[PDB]
Write a protein that binds this ligand. Structure first.
Ligand SMILES: O=C(Nc1ccc(Cl)cc1)Nc1ccc(Cl)c(Cl)c1
Length: 127
């Protein structure tokens, strides 16, 4: 593909912890285009978590992460960040970022042609 995505910043954490995921884009990038984080637990479909697009850096969040997540981008670093706070075991999944040749952020995975590999996020009851 003309753009490659590589996620980092996943981890193994405890309930209540924070993690900052990063998506580093390379190739023929255009930073106002929609960047969308999805997550996928085993057996389950990928679901939208958060996304950013457009000239205002407009953020959209799934109800699942209502009040716990902040998405942002740094155009000079071609990087999108997803800060997740107050993590809980139900958040465990592989998080992957995806992009498409439009500033329009959409919640369907179907409309994104370009995907990263994913990073693992595991949240366990403290111990
Ligand atoms: O480049 C991007 N997205 C992007 C978004 C934010 C940052 Cl910081 C960096 C890159 N998309 C894109 C670009 C070209 C094509 Cl063909 C397609 Cl299909 C998608």
């Amino acid at each position: 593909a003309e753009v490659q995505l590589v996620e980092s910043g996943g981890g193994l954490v405890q309930t209540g912890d924070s993690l900052r995921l990063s998506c580093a884009a390379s190739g023929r990038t255009y930073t106002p285009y929609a960047m969308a984080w999805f997550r996928q637990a085993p057996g389950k479909e990928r679901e939208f978590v958060a996304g950013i697009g457009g000239i205002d850096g407009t953020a959209a969040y799934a109800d699942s992460v209502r009040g716990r997540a902040t998405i942002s981008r740094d155009s000079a670093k071609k990087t999108v960040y997803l800060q997740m706070n107050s993590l809980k075991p139900e958040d465990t999944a592989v998080y992957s970022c995806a992009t498409r040749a439009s500033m329009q952020v959409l919640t369907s995975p179907r409309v994104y042609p370009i995907w990263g590999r994913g990073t693992q996020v595991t949240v366990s009851s403290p111990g």
